[PDB]
């Protein structure tokens with residue numbers, strides 16, 4: 001078929017499965033959330049928490065689906081249909097090494113639901129406690145062993161792919177042991193080889209040698225807020241792609257529709273980026289496409305805490321809070337606008 005409605009399998013959308021309901025999970029997990037203290041504020045801070053009631057959830061926006069459980073099969077089915085609408089072929093699943101049965105259950109449900117709609121799943125490996133190259137290898141082995149035969153498990157030209165959040169917290173001399181073909185615990189030329197995509201944060205002076213010396217296969221930028229880092233400043237993307245191509249690396253810029261996290265980080269107003277009826281999203285996605293990259297990542301499907309979500313949101317005013325919403329656009333606008341940009345991306349690919 002050549003209808004311009006097909007999934008794009010070089011488009012990765014960052015997905016969070018940490019939401020709960022009292023009924024399914026025992027608590028409205030993540031809808032309730034601690035308010036972060038000000039890193040530059042007083043020493044006697046009692047910031048408190050967001051209770052995660054119907055009236056007061058840990059987001060500046062409000063989900064169309066309500067305080068949903070990420071364990072709810074019917075929520076998962078709706079999410080996969082939303083992925084189909086957005087034409088986002090790859091769900092990049094947050095992964096925190098929780099080693100508990102409820103997470104294992106969610107991962108299986110997600111894979112199954114994804115496959116029903118021909119969506120693929122890869123893992124976004126987060127900075128879990130004591131993360132290091134040895135337990136990363138062990139966890140990569142576990143994930144590939146457990147899920148590698150699942151039909152929804154993502155592969156690019158035969159290789160799995162992982163995004164590694166805050167990869168800079170691990171020294172290149174450690175990374176090399178895992179990622180150099182010569183490394184003492186290398187995954188290269190093994191059953192566990194994978195495209196490893198590290199987080200490009202700061203200036204080329206620092207990041208270029210880091211990426212080369214760590215032997216990452218590529219890099220992404222994550223942050224939805226333009227200018228938050230050098231990597232998340234879209235005017236740098238042409239130059240970043242040039243370097244990537246010169247050095248055999250895969251550049252996967254992250255684009256987002258906006259940013260606001262002030263419910264959970266009330267001191268962090270400087271990072272707010274307004275959606276302005278979709279123009280912000282358009283500007284950022286346009287920059288990614290114009291940079292001539294082979295793959296794009298979307299921050300995010302449902303990071304509701306950070307207000308970067310493309311998942312449908314609805315207008316809501318409670319006695320506790322007046323939520324932001326999609327303004328002059330319909331709840332599914334960011335899904336359909338994503339499909340539009342996926343089309344433009346494919347057009348120039």
Ligand SMILES: OC[C@H]1O[C@H](O[C@H]2[C@@H](O)[C@H](O)[C@@H](CO)O[C@H]2O)[C@@H](O)[C@@H](O)[C@@H]1O
Nearest residue numbers: 166201223225228229261265268271306
């Ligand atoms: O200050 C809150 C800040 O937290 C996150 O970013 C973290 C870290 O993960 C990241 O590597 C660096 C990049 O400079 O910033 C840290 O403080 C993230 O949630 C961000 O959006 C937020 O503003």
Ligand SMILES: OC[C@H]1CNC[C@@H](O[C@H]2O[C@H](CO)[C@@H](O)[C@H](O)[C@H]2O)[C@@H]1O
Nearest residue numbers: 014094124126127165222264303305306
């Ligand atoms: O997925 C990468 C990145 C995206 N932003 C959130 C990061 O996690 C951190 O912040 C959230 C709230 O936004 C907290 O709930 C987490 O505990 C914290 O680690 C995440 O790593």
